[PDB]
């Protein structure tokens, strides 16, 4: 038990505990913390417990172990697909809605199970584990990994050694993401991971209740990083045993399926105390077994699941907007803000699918350029309740001048956002078609290209609607609404 | 899964499927929300979540299961006329994709911190949850 690692974690916690330094210097703070992370990583052995064989050699163990406990192991087989890695390949014809998967909870790994595990003494006193379910679940996975006589050890056997999450990025692969909004989320993720690792290694070394855990003998950055990455990439929500609350869970034999566009088809059957997944679509013989991971943007996909999906219709680019404190309509508009549920300032999303804008957006904008004379109509009158109800109705403009001003401001901000980026869309497409980059650089550059494409489409939509309203100005329509 | 929230000395359930006994013990109601609040003699075992999760789990009564779903923030959405409520303004309606057919109303959608709202509307592959976090008065006395 070397003492140098303790000082390294202490220094790391001290540095990362400070608030965000600001713009421009976030990069320098990132490289500083990455330097400390790298030095400690090469100061440790990495994976505390390593399986002698390869990942693909343990799948039959999963089949036998699950079959003994009533988890379906028929109708599919394990194959390493080149484009998404390991997955499930159907051994027969599966029709839509067909139920080919069910796993009893006994098999499932849950925060409650961790509370019933040897981690319970630590869970009792430490608040941090109490707050986030994923963190406690990750520590449960780590504790079970070092125990050869673990009921879930066959599950742990097949988990991949390394993933494609941002924590696996090198300085160049994060450099390719510079000037984009997602980099700030990468910053927050990496800083949180570092602070958690430092605090947790020091508590485990000092907390007496951790004496009996298998982690005390070896708690490296690689182990914690792998655990957090796995829980973050293959986690699903299930209710507590009593049914009072829901909690995070890792579902073996289900989360190993890849993602495709569609509708959620995974649900847990509390009455049977098991999780059942219905077929997302018709998977013929030899076709891959797909499921829907949720309605998350490609930015979240890259940050958490660890890959980028093409043709994703549910993508979005956070946009920071707000009303400056120097407008003469602040006091009168705050009444709507309070009554419209719209905060003073918050992060909004532009949607790739039509309509590009979102109700909460149409609302903030309608309140960002509207004139004063029209700012009391929604406050007084029998139509005030109807006006606030329809305040998000695109088909109901409050006024045509507010519309043209809104679309003007939208084009202005979108053009500013396009200018802000370091590179151009043409260069990105040429790099994708010409160069041969690694997978991680590949998804990073694809993410940047997708953000630029969504912004360009937003500019186009704003311009068409602005032209539409200008022609509507040349026209006469009696219905204001 | 009785189709209603039991907390404190109160009962929260959809207005359109409530019984006359609820109105006999009416303390507050709202037609625009399809939310009915009635007083209960017993003490409920459910806690109201005062957090802002946009992802939870809801019970699809038609399937006798519960599904995880990602829902939009509380906002006012047009609701098409049905056999029970004619099309009118409906506030505090969380909208998300899911299975919701007639009679599904009453399923509780649950996140980490507790109850957020209740399934109120369905159709066209869309599911509407009515918020209950706003009314802070709904707590122990
Ligand atoms: Zn919550």
Residue numbers in the entry:
A (entry chain B): 21 to 501
B (entry chain F): 6 to 146
Give sentences from the paper.
SETD3 is an essential host factor for the replication of a variety of enteroviruses that specifically interacts with viral protease 2A. SETD3 functions as an actin-specific histidine N-methyltransferase, and comprises an N-terminal SET domain and a C-terminal Rubisco large subunit methyltransferase (LSMT) like domain. The N- and C-terminal domains of SETD3 form a V-shaped central cleft, within which the actin substrate is recognized and methylated at residue H7318,19.
Specifically, SETD3 1−503 coexpressed with EV71 2A in insect cells was suitable for cryo-electron microscopy (EM) studies, and separately produced SETD3 1−498 and EV71 2A from E. coli were suitable for in vitro complex assembly and crystallization. The poor resolution of our X-ray diffraction data motivated us to switch to a single-particle cryo-EM approach for structural investigation. The coexpressed SETD3 1−503-EV71 2A complex from sf21 cells was suitable for sample vitrification and data collection. Although the molecular mass of this complex was only 73 kDa, we obtained a 3.1 Å cryo-EM density map providing further structural details. We could locate residues 21−501 of SETD3 and residues 6−146 of EV71 2A in the EM density. There are two discrete contacts between SETD3 and EV71 2A domain II, denoted Site-1 and Site-2. Comparing the two independently determined SETD3-2A complex structures showed that while the conformation of each component was highly similar (RMSD between the crystal and EM structures of EV71 2A was 0.49 Å, and that between SETD3 structures was 0.64 Å), their relative positions were slightly shifted, which contributes to the increased overall RMSD to 1.20 Å. We then aligned the crystal and EM structures with respect to SETD3, and identified a rotation between SETD3 and 2A. The rotational axis runs along the β-bII1 strand of EV71 2A, where 2A engages in an intermolecular antiparallel β-strand interaction with the SETD3 SET domain through two backbone hydrogen bonds. Structural variation between the crystal and EM structures reflects a degree of flexibility in the SETD3-2A interaction.
